[PDB]
């Protein structure tokens, strides 16, 4: 798929001829219990980041963009991607770097006096032009130079960040409601508690620990040798929904203690009915848009395109590895075109542009993975799961009574489970674990019995330094330079690593298909 045909739109056309003949199977392969369990799992895994990022978006943008706009954008883009995308297992949604750009743009528009919502409309206009030209000249073929080195580094960094934020939310709960000898028994409740409350932080930790515990116990039970196998398989597939049901039920029966719940908006209305409508005029709402910023929108559009491109294409690389047993193919040109074009169109409606999110998509692919009798047997590659997830996200406003009884702590345990299980296929994480293991224990893999142990540990430590560098850059004001610092790993792998590693260790350690050279 990464071959360069030389014909205009050749990559886009080849992607359609490769995946669309499988469309009939893309519907009928979803008629399994595991596909339904994944929809409940990815429904929450896509709804909770949507709500959190929409609320934080509303707090930083003054409600120009908020929870409702993000939810509608996520639903529409996910439906259109599941119906038309060549890799339907990707989950399209909002990400942290996108939120960092939205704040950075809002702050610039406020500093210069521009309307932020109108300014985005022009970024979305420039986004469509950039992606059409890139797809026309098969610009997605440069993805072939992102080896397992950069892919594994990026995936490990994203998973570590996800785990860190999941824990930091629990620490935030503990700071908001600290353990004290005395509390005020009369504390205002609406909209959120105005003071510390007893038992809140400790119950939130228990509902997180318990969710993670049952999730992992049911995951181990699926691979276990207990019960008739078909019953064990159906119970293990519903593992995460069963754990969510158990703990939510546990919070539901303790009614004296307060726990923070999911809060969807009241209806399908803009977050700010006084600032903007559903449609944004490109020439301005309250002030005429300057003509210089219409051309100056290309640079933020270039940055947004770089962010979305790197995130989505590296996610597609990760989920479509040969070791994952994907037999249906993926489209690096069609998916990028769909994502960026839908983002540019949603910019006109005052809605966030999205990207394929690594943790969500890897969790979606893992929930559809069927394991043989330790080894991966097949993946339930279909379109119904992601489409139903997007439909449920769009309908999440209507199911407020159900979602108002689900605590965040249960979802926090689910997120910790997702972050832990997203590390399974990353060889950098296995090599990090081999650092603490005595050499005789090291497994029978090509990079152990064809590379000296200290050489392999040096290769791992060089990757660890890259991880630390990327983590430091993220925690700085210049966190939007993260795609460039990540792309700096490719010249490191191709130019500097040959200098101190011979070719055979490079073939054994950085292998696309995990082969012994």
């Amino acid at each position: 798929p990464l071959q360069q045909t030389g014909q205009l739109f050749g990559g886009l056309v080849r992607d359609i001829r490769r995946r669309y003949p499988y469309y009939l199977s893309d519907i009928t392969d979803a008629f399994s219990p595991q596909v339904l369990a994944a929809v409940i799992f990815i429904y929450f895994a896509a709804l909770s980041p949507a709500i959190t990022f929409g609320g934080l978006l509303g707090e930083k943008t003054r409600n120009q963009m908020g929870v409702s706009e993000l939810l509608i954008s996520t639903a529409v883009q996910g439906i259109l991607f599941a119906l038309l995308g060549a890799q339907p297992l990707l989950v399209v949604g909002f990400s942290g770097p996108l939120l960092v750009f939205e704040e950075a743009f809002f702050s610039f528009c406020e500093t210069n006096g521009l309307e932020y919502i109108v300014g985005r409309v022009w970024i979305g206009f420039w986004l469509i032009l950039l992606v059409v030209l890139v797809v026309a000249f098969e610009g997605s073929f440069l993805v072939r130079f992102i080896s397992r080195y950069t892919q594994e580094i990026f995936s490990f960094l994203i998973s570590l960040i996800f785990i860190y934020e999941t824990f930091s939310k629990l620490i935030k709960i503990f700071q908001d409601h600290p353990l004290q000898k005395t509390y005020n028994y009369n504390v205002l409740m609406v909209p959120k508690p105005q003071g510390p409350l007893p038992n809140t932080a400790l119950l939130s930790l228990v509902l997180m620990a318990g969710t993670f515990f049952f999730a992992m116990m049911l995951r181990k039970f699926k691979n276990s040798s207990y019960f008739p196998g078909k019953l064990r398989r159906v119970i293990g597939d519903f593992g995460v929904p069963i754990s969510i049901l158990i703990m939510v039920l546990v919070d539901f029966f303790i009614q004296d203690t307060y726990t923070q719940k999911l809060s969807v908006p009241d209806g399908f209305k803009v977050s700010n009915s006084s600032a903007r409508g559903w449609v944004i005029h490109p020439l301005g709402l309250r002030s005429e848009f300057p003509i210089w910023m219409m051309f100056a929108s290309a640079l933020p559009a270039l940055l947004v395109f770089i962010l979305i491109f790197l995130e989505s294409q590296i996610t597609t690389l990760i989920v479509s590895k040969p070791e994952r047993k994907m037999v249906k193919g993926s489209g690096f040109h069609l998916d990028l075109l769909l994502v960026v074009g839908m983002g540019g169109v949603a910019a006109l409606f005052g809605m966030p542009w999205l990207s394929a999110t690594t943790v969500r998509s890897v969790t979606h692919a893992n929930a559809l993975t069927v394991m043989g009798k330790a080894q991966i047997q097949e993946v339930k590659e279909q379109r119904i799961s992601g489409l139903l997830v997007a439909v449920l996200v769009g309908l999440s406003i209507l199911m407020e009574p159900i979602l108002s009884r689900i605590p965040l702590a249960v979802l926090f345990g689910i997120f910790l489970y997702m972050g832990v299980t997203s590390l399974s296929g990353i060889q950098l994480f296995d090599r990090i674990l081999l650092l603490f293991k005595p050499p005789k224990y090291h497994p029978d893999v090509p990079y152990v019995k064809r590379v000296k142990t200290w050489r392999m540990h040096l290769f791992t430590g060089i990757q660890i330094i890259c991880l630390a560098v990327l983590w430091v850059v993220k925690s700085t004001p210049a966190s939007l330079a993260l795609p460039f610092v990540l792309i700096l790993t490719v010249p490191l792998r191709r130019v500097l690593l040959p200098l101190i590693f011979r070719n055979v260790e490079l073939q054994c350690l950085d292998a696309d298909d995990a082969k012994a050279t």
């Binding site: 032009l129 030209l133 026309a136 006084s274 903007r276 409508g277 944004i280 005029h281 490109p282 020439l283």
Partner: protein, 40 residues
């Protein structure tokens, strides 16, 4: 939309089709130039 908005010469559909047509013409321009190059 909302509240009191500025009334422009072109409505939102008019201006968005204008911008779309300009973008389509531009894209055709780079495509035709690229067709001209790599052949001479």
């Amino acid at each position: 939309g909302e509240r009191v908005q500025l009334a422009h010469h072109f409505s939102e559909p008019e201006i968005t089709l204008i911008i779309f047509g300009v973008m389509a013409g531009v894209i055709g321009t780079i495509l035709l130039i690229s067709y001209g190059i790599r052949r001479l």
